[model samples]
Target: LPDSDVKQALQAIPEEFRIAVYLADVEGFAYKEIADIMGTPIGTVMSRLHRGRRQLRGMLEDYAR
Candidate 1:
């Protein structure tokens, strides 16, 4: 997806999830790196990515429809 569309979709999620998703998916950071940047646990970072991707997918699906 284009960065603009992705950026817009990201706004639908929570702020924490937004940064996590951007760092991991957009910037290609590892889970640990994301956790460190966000000062969160590795498990938390993983959870955020899981939830963030799901939310992003849902939003995009709705947009397509």
Candidate 2:
């Protein structure tokens, strides 16, 4: 189960979403700033921040399931 493809899947989360989550969760960047960097609307950034994190967490947990 811990094969390369699985590892790649864990790493292959969407790039924009990843940035949104990292900025919001880790770097503590404001939503506006994340939107600016991602060239998206603040609402979109917020959605990504929420959904992306959920998806990433799901992916991480997939290994256990």
Candidate 3:
């Protein structure tokens, strides 16, 4: 799989976590910025970031091998 597959992987996750991962990793936004962008609290943003990245890691792990 190539980088193009990442979008499909993202699509497999929840929308909230997906946007959080996109904004933080792909768009390089700070937690506060992501919070503002997503209209969520900073704590919620942090939780999403953690969960999103963890889920993404799980989804992409097979690709890494």
The RMSD of every model to the true structure, in order and in angstroms, is 1.2, 4.8, 2.0
The reply for model 2, stretches above 4 Å from the true place, is 1-10, 63-65
Give the per-residue lDDT of model 3 (tens digit) for 1-65: 35767788888889999999888877889999988898999999999888988988887687676
Q: Number of the top candidate by TM-score?
A: 1
Give each model's clash number: 0, 0, 0
Pairs that clash in candidate 1: none
For each candidate, the alpha-carbon lDDT, in order, equals: 0.88, 0.75, 0.86
Quote the positional error of residue 52 for candidate 2 in Å.
0.6
For model 1, what is the error of residue 20's alpha carbon versus the real structure, in angstroms, after optimal superposition?
0.6
lDDT tens digits by residue: candidate 1, 1-52: 7557778788879998899999998899999988889998999999998999
Per-residue lDDT of candidate 2, residues 1-65 (tens digit): 34445335535778777778767766789999888888898999999878787887787786676
Error of model 1, residue 5, in angstroms? 1.5
Ordering by TM-score:
1, 3, 2
What is the descending lDDT order? 1, 3, 2
Model 2 local distance difference test score: 0.75
Task: State which candidate has the highest lDDT.
Answer: 1
Off by over 4 Å in 1: none
Model 3 scores what on Cα lDDT? 0.86
Better of 1 and 2 by lDDT: 1
